[PDB]
């Protein structure tokens, strides 16, 4: 009934580890692409199905490896994830959003044949960490056709983003690089009230929480991406009536919890 439904029925523990799909990677060379500095694509193997695309941006001075695990994680649960390298490690959120748009264009038009065989170009989303999360919000403004957006401990001088693209903002309670009361929380509060939006706050986490395998980040990112890129209602259960002990705060306009 749902053509985009992938994988078995999800349980929460199954979302804290790699999914049913085997993952292959492709190394997008820095000089083989214009508009961004290459990166790594993670895509399912041993399957003839098609999956939505995700473009991921690391943060200031960081590179794609800082999100490698995550680029793998979503991939094993049924996605084509391209975690980008930027032209400069000192690029700022708007440049990173431009490079994310470039990476999505590459994924749709110039990716290898094996990647292109697994990609549904009509279902795309974006994720990022810090200045990459701010870029996530900015591109959600620029490309309103995106299915979802997941900014992880986002950072941006601008706190207001007018986007209809559903956003799941992860903030780290103890973050001193991008404090939540200055970034994640104001960004959630300034998102349009019609846009479906979730704010999860990882209890006692610091700014580098998304740079290694994290149970809560994995669960909520997979849930958001499944709910919006795959229209997969089976994951609504993890995003509604939440009592997660790893979280120090959960906010939502609860527009995703309805039928």
PDB file of C-alpha atoms in Angstrom, residues 2 17 67 75 81 83 138 149 151 166-167 207:
ATOM      1  CA  UNK A   2       2.982   2.268   0.683  1.00  0.00           C
ATOM      2  CA  UNK A  17      22.197  -0.209  15.355  1.00  0.00           C
ATOM      3  CA  UNK A  67      29.450  11.933  10.402  1.00  0.00           C
ATOM      4  CA  UNK A  75      22.070   3.833   4.805  1.00  0.00           C
ATOM      5  CA  UNK A  81      23.255   9.242   2.098  1.00  0.00           C
ATOM      6  CA  UNK A  83      27.991  13.091   3.525  1.00  0.00           C
ATOM      7  CA  UNK A 138      18.950  27.412   5.306  1.00  0.00           C
ATOM      8  CA  UNK A 149      15.518  18.235   7.709  1.00  0.00           C
ATOM      9  CA  UNK A 151      19.846  19.789  12.234  1.00  0.00           C
ATOM     10  CA  UNK A 166       9.682  19.291   8.599  1.00  0.00           C
ATOM     11  CA  UNK A 167      12.589  19.768  11.008  1.00  0.00           C
ATOM     12  CA  UNK A 207      28.571  19.597  21.070  1.00  0.00           C
TER      13      UNK A 207
END
